[PDB]
């Protein structure tokens, strides 16, 4: 939720006054990198002028600095006017108290608030050590902390313990909830990295979880794939993706990891709109046999927005739609690859939520494709998720996680889910 209006903020409003010292105010922002989104408090210097006054929190949007609005202005317009302020001067800012982080807005799980990572790091070397184990406790303080948090808290056991924190539960722990606690142990990019290599390893992929990680991962998230992979596993993700697919689907698999998608513009394409709905027809279903390098080129390199324009516009050519004309055209790993790719791109928590409920919707569960979707969307797009869920199939996802798991393991889930619908 955004609104360039302090007639349209719901929160309470704040009134500050900070003088610049030597160091700066004292206080990191973030946000404000985007068209319409917020520019909120992140961190504060707890011995600058903005600690010191106290008035000022985490999360705290700013609605206007020295009597001007600055709600809808980017992050390097904010940045310049603080910086501008020379060393003694004052600045005059008014805040607004009641809406989440902007990078977390639809993720389940939030950023503890009284956080202490040296207090969660004893506890849970506590839990470790108790006889039989203590599972509820690490289970109630791994879920409830953000990704970040839980890096401090692995730093701080290993401080404390000379030993790691994912070798200790490692042997703790067994089972699926291994497999979750171990998981959010791991950042983004590391875990994305580790399922990456996983479904790699012998000589049959996992082409299932490669296409899921692949299609659905971002140009940001996979350039820190990218990055990390090679960090931890001494070679390019792009020469482990040719090693281990063919065809036309090793092609579609090494163009969508490169991350490098043209980004969404500000003008709408329309001529090239109608122009890529056009060339995805013929390529296709207007003819005997399928132009895949067009398919392709044209979905992996246009911006997400762009392509949800053209499918829509693809409907006036094809009397199937994008989808169908998949099935139609085109099969196995290639096809799978398709359908999950322009899924991604028309609703991305559509398709996790289609994902889980095929997870559990028949006899057992796909534990492997119900942890990594619970694990990496936890502080993404979950509630997203969990509204599409709902929607389409009229029950939660945490009745149906509820119904095909048990134990501690089902609590952690249902943690990660973050409530009913
Ligand atoms: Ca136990
Ligand atoms: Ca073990
Ligand atoms: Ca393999
Ligand atoms: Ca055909
Ligand atoms: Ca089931």
Aim: with cysteine; glycine share 8%.
């Amino acid at each position: 939720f955004f609104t360039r209006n302090p007639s349209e903020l719901k929160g309470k409003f704040i009134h500050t006054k900070l003088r610049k010292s030597s160091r700066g105010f004292g206080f990191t922002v973030v946000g404000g990198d985007e068209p319409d989104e917020f520019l909120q408090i992140k961190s504060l210097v707890l011995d600058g002028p903005a600690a010191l006054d106290g008035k000022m929190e985490t999360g705290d949007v700013i609605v206007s600095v020295n009597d001007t609005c600055v709600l809808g202005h980017t992050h390097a317009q904010v940045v310049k006017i603080f910086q501008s302020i020379p060393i003694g001067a004052s600045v005059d800012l008014e805040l607004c108290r009641g809406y989440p982080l902007g990078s977390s807005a639809y993720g389940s799980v939030k950023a503890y608030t009284n956080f202490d990572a040296e207090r969660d790091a004893l506890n849970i070397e506590t839990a470790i050590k108790t006889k039989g184990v203590d599972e509820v406790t690490i289970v109630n303080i791994l879920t409830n902390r953000s990704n970040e948090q839980r890096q401090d808290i692995a730093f701080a056991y290993q401080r404390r313990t000379k030993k790691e924190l994912a070798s200790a539960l490692k042997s703790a722990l067994s089972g699926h909830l291994e497999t979750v606690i171990l998981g959010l142990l791991k950042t983004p990019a590391q875990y994305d990295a580790s399922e990456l290599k996983a479904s790699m390893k012998g000589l049959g992929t996992d082409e299932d979880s490669l296409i899921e990680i692949i299609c659905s991962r971002t140009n940001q998230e996979l350039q820190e794939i990218n990055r990390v992979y090679k960090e931890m596993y001494k070679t390019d993700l792009e020469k482990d993706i040719i090693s281990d697919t063919s065809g036309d689907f090793r092609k579609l698999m090494v163009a969508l990891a490169k991350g490098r998608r043209a980004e969404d513009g500000s003008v709408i394409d329309y001529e090239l709109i109608d122009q890529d709905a056009r060339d995805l027809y013929d390529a296709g279903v207007k003819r005997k046999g399928t132009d895949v390098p067009k398919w392709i080129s044209i979905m992996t390199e246009r911006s997400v927005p762009h392509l949800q324009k053209v499918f829509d516009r693809y409907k006036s050519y094809s009397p199937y739609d994008m989808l169908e004309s998949i099935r139609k055209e085109v099969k196995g790993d290639l096809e799978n690859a398709f359908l999950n790719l322009v899924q991604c791109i028309q609703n991305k928590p559509l398709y996790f939520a289609d994902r889980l409920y095929d997870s559990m919707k028949g006899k057992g569960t796909r534990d492997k494709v119900l942890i990594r979707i619970m694990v990496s969307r936890s502080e993404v797009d979950m509630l997203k998720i969990r509204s599409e869920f709902k929607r389409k199939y009229g029950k939660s996802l945490y009745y149906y996680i509820q119904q095909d798991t048990k134990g501690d393991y089902q609590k952690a889930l249902l943690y990660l889910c973050g409530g009913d619908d």
